Amino acid sequence: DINVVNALAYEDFVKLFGNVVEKCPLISAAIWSYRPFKDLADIEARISEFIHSLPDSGKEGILRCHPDLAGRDLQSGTLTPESQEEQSQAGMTTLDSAEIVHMYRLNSEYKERFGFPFVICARLNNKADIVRQLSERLKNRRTAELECAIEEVKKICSLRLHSI
Amino acid sequence: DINVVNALAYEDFVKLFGNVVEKCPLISAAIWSYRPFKDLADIEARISEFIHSLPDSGKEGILRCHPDLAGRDLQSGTLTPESQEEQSQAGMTTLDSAEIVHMYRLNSEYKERFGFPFVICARLNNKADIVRQLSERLKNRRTAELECAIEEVKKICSLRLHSIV
Ligand SMILES: Nc1nc2[nH]cnc2c(=O)[nH]1
Ligand SMILES: Nc1nc2[nH]cnc2c(=O)[nH]1
């Protein structure tokens, strides 16, 4: 109900929507300035516009706020509730020993190449697609990869928003 | 050592500097793109330029990530380690029932007017100073207050950085 959303104090709006972009409450806090919203699509569009207004470093920064697939946070049970649901859904919590090592190596190569973590919309992909995509995007030039990666962020955000 | 800072993996740089702007690790994460940093001043300069490049809503967003002085999070013991230290140093952790209620009302008026929390460099102000600032700044136009508040965020950030040093 967008009417209830529109009457939210900023503190409650930030509590409700503060993690639609992983560890970036500033982004959802910002868009509250554009209330009232027509609908959830309006909120989505504002978030996309905000991300797009950022310098490249800002986009890279958003990426760096995301946890590795199957990395330290997943293994240590210190993911945000959203990342935990997403990573479980993509098969990350039931990887075997060889798969864990493989994800480590792939993540390591990616982050060494690009200087931010590998991000892919987990809810839209299964385990096998994830590995294929890691390997494929590993071949991208940095500018093209930044665009690709941010598109994945925007997909994650849309799903998060619609899960609320 | 700035050499040691420059050698940090982004994951470690974010871990160390991720809260120099309250609940805004994104800012520390972004500026790592600009390494090597010449010095501490370069880091602060990159932080300042990043914030300045945001739309006004982004600057408001940053403000909205800060907890109220003496507010719900302080009472619940759920402030960030830095925020707790800053507010304790400013005398917010030893207010009586009356004071706790009074902080609430001035903050309510302010946030209703401006649409973001009252932010002041707390390590540079005592109990009384804070109230006077709140009452004076309540008079500002919104355009001006945003600029005033963001300057305070940058002061807080500067001192958070120096504490790490
Ligand atoms: N959905 C999703 N994709 C990711 N890509 C990298 N980390 C994540 C995560 O936590 N969730
Ligand atoms: N230093 C400091 N100033 C503030 N102004 C409003 N909240 C805070 C806070 O947590 N710390």
Separation CA A141–CA A151 (nearest Å): 16
Which residue type is seen at B113?
Answer: R
* Structural determination approach: X-ray
How far is residue B87 from each of residues A109, B33, B99, B100, measured CA to CA in Å? 43, 32, 14, 13
Separation CA A66–CA B156 (nearest Å): 25
DSSP track, A38-103: SSHHHHHHHHHHHHHHS-HHHHHHHHHTSPPTTSHHHHHT---HHHHHHHHHTTGGG--HHHHHHH
CA B139, chain centre distance (Å): 21
Separation CA B41–CA A107 (nearest Å): 33
Q: Which of B23, B50, B56 is opposite residue A25, by nearest beta carbon? A: B23
Q: Which of B53, B111, B116 is opposite residue A55, by nearest beta carbon? A: B53
Catalytic residue among B52, B66, B102, B162: B66
Residue B49: count other Cβ atoms within 10 Å of its Cβ. Answer: 13
Separation CA B64–CA B58 (nearest Å): 10
Which domains, from first to last, does chain A contain?
A: 1-164 (1.10.3330.10)
Residue B44: count other Cβ atoms within 10 Å of its Cβ. Answer: 18
Separation CA A17–CA A25 (nearest Å): 8
Residue A10: count other Cβ atoms within 10 Å of its Cβ. Answer: 20
> Residue B23 region, left (φ>0) first, then alpha (ψ -120 to 50), else beta?
left
Q: Are A41 and B123 in contact (CB under 8 A)?
A: no
Q: Are B33 and A60 in contact (CB under 8 A)?
A: yes
**Residue B50 phi/psi, 5° resolution?**
-65, -50
Take residue A114 and report the two structure tokens written for it.
Answer: 């690009």
Report chain A's terminal Cα–Cα distance, integer Å.
11
Resolution stated for this PDB structure, in Å: 1.8
Separation CA A130–CA A88 (nearest Å): 13
Do B29 and A53 count as a contact with CB atoms less than 8 A apart?
no
Q: Whose CA is nearest to atom 1 of ligand 2?
A: B122
